[PDB]
């Protein structure tokens, strides 16, 4: 009850509940780039590429980011199944593994972010408004709500010779 029902571990776990959906806001919305030739204004994403002058023509062609963000959405499911099952049956060791997959799901958007930047750099201007700063707020959420959950979930430094990491009780 001490590492799983403390409030400092549930403020963090509710914070991941924000970043679990903001990284889902990014992975469906295709709004993190603006092609601006000057009409041929196109808005890039992972899955659909839509050119807007209504003449809303959304289609596909980017592959790297898409493939990479199957894993960022893959670790997330795999981390929550560890996290949803670690609040019951008095097991808390499981809380730590869940914190692993949220760092990874954090860092598998950050490849995605870097992968999407190259596409806009090779292809007329660039501007991101709606879903790069979404995912750069779900990167920084999941990457840092994972490392802090990790240090909030371990037994902790003993601070005395008798105390030990991983011991009686």
């Amino acid at each position: 009850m001490s590492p799983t029902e403390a409030p400092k571990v549930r403020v963090t776990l509710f914070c991941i509940l924000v970043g679990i959906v903001l990284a889902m806001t990014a992975v469906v919305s295709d709004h993190w780039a603006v092609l601006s030739p000057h009409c041929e204004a196109a808005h890039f994403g992972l899955w659909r590429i839509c050119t807007k002058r209504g003449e809303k023509n959304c289609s596909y062609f980017s592959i790297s980011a898409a493939a990479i963000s199957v894993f960022s959405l893959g670790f997330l499911i795999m981390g929550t199944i560890c996290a949803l099952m670690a609040f019951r049956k008095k097991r808390d060791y499981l809380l730590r593994p869940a914190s692993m997959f949220y760092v990874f799901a954090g860092l598998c958007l950050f490849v995605s972010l870097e992968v999407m930047r190259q596409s806009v750099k090779r292809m007329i201007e660039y501007y991101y408004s709606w879903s790069f700063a979404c995912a750069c707020a779900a990167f920084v959420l999941l990457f840092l709500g994972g490392i802090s959950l990790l240090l909030f979930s371990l037994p902790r430094m003993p601070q005395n010779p008798w105390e030990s990491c991983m011991d009686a009780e």
Partner: protein, 73 residues
């Protein structure tokens, strides 16, 4: 082997086993990446190097000294 020999309850109990798990997973992703690259991220090739930290799992004087100071800071 370690997992099969600790029903997963005692494996994830040792703070070093968690580090082991972390390293492994990342190292694999690295390989799969290097793969889906050529089938159709200089951060994942850093999971190979982090294995060396395990060595700190046996060294008992280094580990001890380390903890001692990391506990004062």
């Amino acid at each position: 082997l370690k997992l099969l020999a600790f029903k997963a309850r005692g494996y994830f109990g040792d703070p070093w086993n968690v580090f082991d798990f972390l390293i492994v997973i990342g190292s694999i992703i690295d390989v799969i990446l290097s793969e889906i690259d050529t089938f159709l991220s200089a951060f994942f090739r850093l999971f190979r190097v982090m294995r060396l930290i395990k060595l700190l799992s046996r060294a008992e004087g280094v580990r001890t000294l380390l903890w001692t100071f990391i506990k004062s800071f």
